[PDB]
Amino acid sequence: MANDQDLSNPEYLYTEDDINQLLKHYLGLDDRISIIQHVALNESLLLKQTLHQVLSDIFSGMQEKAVIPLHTGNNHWVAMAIKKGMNDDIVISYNDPMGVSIDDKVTLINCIKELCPGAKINDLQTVQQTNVYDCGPFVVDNLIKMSQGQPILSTEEAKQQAQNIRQSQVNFLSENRMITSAAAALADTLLKNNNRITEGVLVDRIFDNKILSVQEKQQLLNNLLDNHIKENKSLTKESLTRMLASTHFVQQQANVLLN
Amino acid sequence: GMQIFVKTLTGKTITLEVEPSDTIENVKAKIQDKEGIPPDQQRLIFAGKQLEDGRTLSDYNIQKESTLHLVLRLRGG
Amino acid sequence: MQIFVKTLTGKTITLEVEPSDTIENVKAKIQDKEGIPPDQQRLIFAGKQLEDGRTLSDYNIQKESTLHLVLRLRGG
Amino acid sequence: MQIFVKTLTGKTITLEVEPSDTIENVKAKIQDKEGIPPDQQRLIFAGKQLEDGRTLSDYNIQKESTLHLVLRLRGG
C-alpha cells in the first residue's frame, strides 16, 4: 500500500512541489528565468493566463526564459520551455517523455496561436521514460537542459540514466524536505499562537526561548542578521519557515536527522 | 479600490476588494474571511505561480479583474 | 519623430511623437490609432516598464526606437 | 538618557547616552563597559539592524528603550 506516496520508492510520482523545489534549486538564483509551478491543460483560464504572462514577459524582455512543468490533466507531466529564438522569434520547446507529440493538444496549440501566432513550437517528440513513473524526473532534467540551451536526453541516454537522475533528484528532495520540516517546527515554537509576528518580536522570542542553548541562539541570530532584521517586516508561518530554511542553523539540524 | 476574482476548490468564483499594495497573506486572510478556508490550506495561483507571503499583488503584476485560482496539488508518472 | 510599438500578435504600429511627450500621451495616441484603452496598455523600452508621468526623453527614447506593448488578456 | 542592551547570556547592560550619539559611539560604550570590540557587535532595535553612521534619534530610540546585542561567531 501507497508506494506512489513514498519518496524513496522507485514508483514515487513527483508532485508540483517536488518539481518546483528541484527547478528552484538548479535555476532559482537567476531572476531572468520564470519558474511556473501549477498549470494543467484541463484548466483553460489558468493555462491562457500562464501563457499570456510568460509570452508577454519574453516578447518584451522582462524575462529571458521560462520553464513550465505542464500537467496533461491525466496523471502525467510534460516539459515546455520558452525563450527568444533568432530575430525576436519566440521558440516554445516541448517534450513529453512518453514520446507523444503535441499535435493531440489542440487546446494548447490554439491558445498559443491566439496569443502569439508567430511563435515557433519545437516538439522534440523523444521517448525517455521506460515505465509509468519517471515523467517527473525527465521533465525536471529536460527543463534544466532546455533552459541551458543543451539537447535533452535521447531515448538511449534516457534508458541508461533513468535510475541515476531519479536517485540524484530524490537525494536533493530528501534533504530539502528535512530542512523545511525542521524550519517549520522551529517557526511554530516561535509563533506560539500568533499567525503574525514582526522581525522585532522574532528577535525577542529567540532571546526568551526556553529550549535553544545560548550558542544555538547566537548561530540562528547571526544567520538571520546576514540577510534579515533590517526593516522590521511582518512574518507568517510561511515567510518565517522560508527565512529559517535559509539558515545554516536549520540546515545543520536537518543534516543530523539524515545521517 | 480594485476588485479581483478567486476560483475556489468547489468551482465557485468569489470577488475580493483589494489594493495593489496588499500582501499575499492579507489576500489569503480575505479569502478565509469570505469562504472560511485557512491560509495554510490555500494553494493560491496566479498565472502558474504559487503566491508567497511577504510579497504584494503588484509584485505579481496582479491588476483590476485578475482571477486567482485555489488549487489541488498536481502529481504524475 | 517616429517610434514603433510591437504587440505580442506581431503587429508593429508607427507613432508620431515628440521627446517631451509623456508616457500617458503615448498611450492616448495608441488609443487614438488602435482603439486600445490606456488602462489595458503596459509599455516596455529595453526591458523597463515606462511610468505614466515621465517623458520619452526621460527614458532616452529617440527617433526609430521600438517599444513593446503588453496588452491585458481576454478583451478590453 | 538611559537605554538598555539585552545579550543572549541574559545580561541587561544599561548605557548613558544622548539622542545624537552615533551607533559607532554606542558600540564603543559597550566595549568600554563589557570589553566587546565594536566589529564583533550587531545591534537591533525593534527588528531593525542599527548602522554605524546613524544616530539613536534616527531610529527614534528614546529614554528606557531596549536594544538587542548579538556577537559575531569565531567563524560564521
Numbering used by the authors:
A (entry chain A): 1 to 259
B (entry chain B): 0 to 76
C (entry chain D), D (entry chain C): 1 to 76
What does the paper say about this structure?
To analyze the structural basis of the substrate preferences of OtDUB, we assembled a complex of OtDUB1–259 with free ubiquitin and determined the crystal structure of the complex at 2.2 Å resolution. Three ubiquitin molecules bound to each OtDUB fragment. One ubiquitin is bound to the active site (UbS1, gray) and represents the distal ubiquitin that would remain after cleavage of the proximal ubiquitin at the S1′ site (absent from the structure). The position of UbS1 in the OtDUB complex is rotated nearly 90° relative to the position of UbS1 in complexes with XopD and SdeA. Overall, UbS1 binding to OtDUB buries an extensive interface of nearly 1200 Å2, and results in modest conformational changes in OtDUB (overall RMSD < 1.5 Å) attributable mostly to a slight (~10°) rotation of VR-1 towards UbS1. We also observed the density for two additional ubiquitin molecules: one bound to the side of the OtDUB that we propose represents the S2 site (pink), and a third ubiquitin molecule (yellow) bound to the backside of VR-1 far from the active site, which likely represents the biochemically identified UBD. The interface between UbS1 and the second ubiquitin (pink) bound to the side of OtDUB places the C terminus (R74, red sphere) of the latter ubiquitin near K63 of UbS1. The UbS1 itself is sandwiched between two OtDUB regions: on one side it contacts VR-2, which creates a hydrophobic pocket (OtDUB I36/V39/L46/T50) for G47 of ubiquitin, and on the other, VR-1 uses charged residues (OtDUB R196/E238/R242) to interact with oppositely charged residues of ubiquitin, a noncanonical ubiquitin surface for S1 site interactions. VR-1 folds into a compact helical bundle that presents two antiparallel helices for interaction with the canonical I44 surface patch of ubiquitin, the most common site for UBD interactions.
